[PDB]
Design a protein around this ligand. Structure first.
Ligand SMILES: [Mg+2]
Lengths: 414, 469, 51
RNA sequence: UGAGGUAGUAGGUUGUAU
DNA sequence: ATACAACCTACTACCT
């Protein structure tokens, strides 16, 4: 009732799996060794027993690998013995699948038999197999693809699936813990265009309708602008930051979204100034800016044994990060990783085409662990204390150096 | 420290009602739903191009292997998979002379050069379609690599060798929409990558380890273009219609416009997945604005609802509008003025701009595909790219990017939206791969828009995707 | 709905258009590939569609 | 343009309020 | 018309 398939176990599996599944889905009962995930030690006895007592046809995958394989030859000898015993002239059917193995090199037990040509087309070979099987009255049941689907799921799809295991992922978000109690709008009036540059001030501040909005005191700007030296504390509007972050502010004087945008602007400016304070090299991208270390800054560019500066062939590659504060869903700092290429130890390659090509050439061989370790080391270098680092706001804002972790209930097994 | 939720991998449907996750494996074991009898191919190009195409067609039939058959499944041959004939004997040749190509190739203006080459190919296409008695299912345009190199919008022709979009592919497919001819454009280096080498004596494109993947992609695209259905979704609900809206800039006119194209997917009463376009790109005269007018929004929704009713018999119960932009109040009010009471309108925004990256702590691989991070009742992250255990490799390159899926307008379950998107990611007929990142609605609306905004003289374009992809 | 118009010209035009629109729509807006379109025409249409 | 992915280079719009 | 934030598209370049 069964149909035995014999092949080279680790070499001709691509064709054998296809043929076995195709024949099983067509109603035929197929015995192939790769259909069992649990081969016993005494499997040869079972193979001989199934050849002697079960199989009605013996299909042999003829290839260069299987031409002189010892186990295949032993199976061929047993099949020949059963063929002589059973008085079946067409018990052994060779399926020629290899173009390299010429028809003049087949082994002695096969050189006399009529083979099925799978070299030019597998569909034609399967059509010939089915035509011979119906012509020779090989037993078969009704066609059912469910059997093929189930066997494919069980055998070739058992070690490749998800499992219910807990996993912890490290992100690039920097949750902000501490904020200044109040945000102040100082009514500086004109103040000589209120230092129209604004961006060159010592503290992050913005210009509202007729106020200077910042988290710092009024007298902190006396150095750049002396008009505040006489300005009194009466002309200011103090608002609570925590109330705004909770979506509580209202009224037509100011909108909650505008307040959040102003806070984002202040945080971005403060991050830029603090990152400048660290005395690192700055790269101006198309729509953002990144901060990278030079070749001679560290001893020796191996902070936390992770490496930060290296050489590809003749240039120097440097890891860099770009930060941007955000208030959705919670106040965090988006951190994005980048790589920059310098011809010398501390220089820059002016052309962007070479930089982009080298970046894409380098990124092909880094992967998750390298990216995570380099990002974590670069972000821990900037830490101003054990588990935080500060941005100037008197007041200041502290940001954790440990990115928020994520929990997952499923994962894989490598 | 936040938690994640896993979304099960969707199963696509194949012949004999057999479900599977991998399109390639399902095609290999069971086969396509349709029964094509054979593909009759028309080849256009120089004699070298015809020889290249014939050699590749002969090579396709024999089994093709990859470096790893676990990560990338092998190709057992065209007929063994699709059970239909695509042979080199059914080839119809329309020769294009190399001298004719060179007459138009070296020109000062890239617009004139691309127009002349595109017209040179299309004239032969239409002449063979009208004045020849043989039937051709798909026309295969073999293009020399010089034509590809020197017909790009920003390509420059070296000084020593010296409307409509200045792009060969988009202008080629846009000027063939009046005659409804499915076309497959190939480059000579794609099918003969061995014969084109660089200065170091090695091929520019290395397909040695991915030969079977190339065969899979090409064969699946050719089978779809000839009118066959390789697979379909299996778990999609009844009464819900998916819409995908994409805006594109039109530089053909003096005044810039934002043409909005759509893609529509749903289920018919015969359990077949109806996936097609929604065209007549509704323009906007304001530059930099990607929001539809009330009249154009009404027209779009009315056309979509009328098509659904004609194909089914009644208005859809639910409508989902996937868009890369955020709908505003006026456009949504215009949309709601067309829908009946029984139809629920949901407007979802799908973006890939939010920079959130999750690094696995103790491995060289990436986060599992299907993981989600529900931000709140209207916003979530979906990881459509990542490590797939079935192929033991990641779809991404270095670290996958997440999709920030937000239910901008209407009331719906966010988990259901994520499941619908992750099921849509399995319907890409332009490629034979595991599920890609973006949903098929947005991707195919983008593909439609890139062609409909090439040539202006498109009154009523066809809805089938074989004329665009 | 069109076969019983008094004028032969308008009847034939409307009814030909009814038969033609479906063919064109299935040519452009459907993913099947059709070699020959076999238009089966009843006897009532045929008899009353001559000059 | 076999197809996806990852980046980079440019431009634009919108709410405020100088 | 300047400064900013929050969204938008177009056009390449490299890997497998
Ligand atoms: Mg295509």
């Amino acid at each position: 009732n069964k149909i035995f398939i014999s092949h080279a176990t680790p070499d001709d599996n691509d064709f054998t799996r296809w043929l076995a599944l195709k024949l099983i889905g067509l109603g035929y009962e197929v015995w192939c060794d790769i259909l069992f995930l649990d081969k016993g030690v005494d499997f040869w006895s079972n193979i001989e027993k199934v050849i002697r007592e079960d199989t009605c046809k013996f299909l042999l995958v003829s290839s260069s690998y299987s031409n002189q394989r010892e186990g295949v030859l032993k199976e061929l000898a047993v099949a020949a013995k059963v063929k002589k015993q059973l008085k079946d002239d067409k018990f052994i059917i060779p399926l020629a699948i290899d173009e390299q193995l010429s028809y003049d090199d087949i082994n002695i037990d096969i050189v006399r038999l009529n083979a099925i040509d799978f070299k030019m087309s597998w569909a034609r070979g399967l059509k010939d197999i089915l035509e011979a099987f119906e012509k020779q009255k090989v037993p078969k049941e009704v066609a059912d693809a469910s059997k093929s689907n189930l066997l494919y799921q069980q055998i070739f799809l058992h070690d490749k699936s998800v499992i219910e295991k807990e996993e912890i992922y490290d992100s690039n978000w920097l949750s902000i813990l501490s904020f200044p109690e109040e945000l102040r709008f100082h009514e500086y009036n004109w103040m000589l265009p209120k230092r129209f540059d604004v961006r060159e001030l010592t503290f992050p501040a913005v210009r509202y309708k007729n106020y200077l909005c910042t988290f710092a005191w009024a007298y902190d700007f006396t150095y750049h602008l002396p008009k505040t030296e006489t300005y009194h504390k009466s002309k200011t509007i103090r608002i609570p930051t925590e109330e705004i972050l909770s979506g509580s502010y209202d009224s037509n004087f100011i909108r909650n979204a505008e307040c959040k945008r102003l806070i984002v602007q202040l945080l971005n400016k403060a991050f830029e100034l603090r990152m400048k304070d660290k005395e690192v090299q700055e790269y101006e991208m198309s729509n953002k800016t990144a901060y990278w270390l030079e070749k001679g800054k560290l001893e020796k560019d191996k902070f936390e044994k992770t490496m930060l500066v290296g050489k590809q062939k003749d240039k120097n590659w440097h890891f860099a990060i770009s930060g941007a504060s955000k208030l959705y869903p919670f106040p965090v700092l988006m951190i994005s990783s980048h790589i920059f290429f310098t011809a010398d130890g501390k220089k820059l390659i002016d052309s962007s085409s070479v930089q982009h090509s080298s970046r894409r050439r380098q990124g092909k061989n880094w992967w998750n662990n390298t990216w995570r370790t380099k990002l974590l080391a670069f972000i821990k270098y900037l830490s101003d204390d054990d588990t935080s680092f500060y941005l100037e706001m008197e007041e200041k804002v502290f940001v954790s150096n440990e990115p928020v972790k994520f929990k997952g209930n499923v994962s894989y097994n490598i | 420290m936040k938690e994640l939720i896993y979304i099960e991998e969707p199963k696509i449907l194949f012949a004999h009602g057999q479900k599977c996750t991998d399109a390639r494996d399902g095609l290999a074991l069971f086969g396509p739903l349709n029964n094509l009898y054979g593909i009759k191919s028309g080849v256009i190009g120089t004699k070298q191009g015809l020889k290249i195409f014939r050699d590749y067609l002969d090579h396709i039939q024999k089994p093709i292997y990859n470096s790893n058959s676990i990560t990338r499944p092998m190709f057992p041959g065209f007929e063994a998979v699709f059970d239909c004939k695509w042979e080199s004997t059914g080839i119809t040749f329309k020769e294009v002379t190399n001298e004719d190509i060179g007459k138009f190739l070296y020109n000062s203006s890239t617009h004139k050069r691309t127009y002349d080459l595109v017209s040179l190919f299309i004239d032969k296409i239409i002449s063979a379609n009208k004045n020849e008695d043989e039937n051709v299912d798909v026309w295969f345009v073999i293009v020399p690599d010089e034509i590809y190199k020197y017909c790009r919008p920003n390509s420059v022709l070296p000084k020593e060798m010296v409307n409509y979009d200045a792009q060969f592919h988009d202008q080629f497919k846009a000027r063939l929409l009046k005659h409804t001819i499915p076309t497959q454009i190939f480059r000579e280096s794609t099918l003969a990558w061995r014969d084109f080498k660089n200065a170091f004596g090695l091929p520019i494109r290395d397909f040695s380890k991915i030969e079977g993947h190339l065969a899979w992609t090409i064969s699946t695209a050719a089978f779809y273009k000839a009118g066959g259905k390789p697979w379909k979704l299996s778990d999609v609900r009844n009464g819900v219609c998916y819409l995908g809206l994409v805006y594109k800039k039109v530089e053909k006119s003096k005044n810039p416009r934002n043409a909005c194209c759509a893609a529509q997917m749903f289920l018919d009463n015969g359990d077949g997945t109806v996936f097609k376009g929604e065209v007549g790109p509704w323009y906007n005269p304001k530059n930099g604005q990607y929001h539809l007018e009330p009249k154009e929004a009404k027209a779009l929704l009315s056309q979509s609802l009328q098509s659904y009713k004609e194909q089914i018999g009644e208005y859809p119960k639910e409508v989902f509008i996937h868009a890369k932009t955020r709908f505003n109040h006026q456009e949504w009010d215009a949309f709601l003025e067309v829908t009946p009471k029984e139809t629920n309108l949901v407007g979802v925004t799908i973006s890939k701009t939010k920079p959130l990256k999750l690094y696995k702590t103790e491995g060289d691989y990436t986060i599992l595909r299907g993981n989600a991070y529900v931000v709140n009742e209207r916003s979530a992250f979906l990881w459509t790219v990542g490590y797939v255990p079935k192929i033991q490799t990641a779809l991404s390159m270095e670290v996958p990017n997440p999709l920030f899926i937000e239910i901008n307008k209407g009331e719906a379950d966010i988990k259901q939206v994520l499941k619908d998107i992750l099921s849509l990611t399995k319907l890409n007929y332009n490629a034979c791969i595991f599920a890609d990142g973006e949903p098929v609605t947005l991707r195919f609306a983008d593909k439609i828009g890139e062609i409909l905004t090439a040539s202006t003289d498109i009154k009523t374009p066809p809805l089938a995707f074989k004329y665009y992809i």
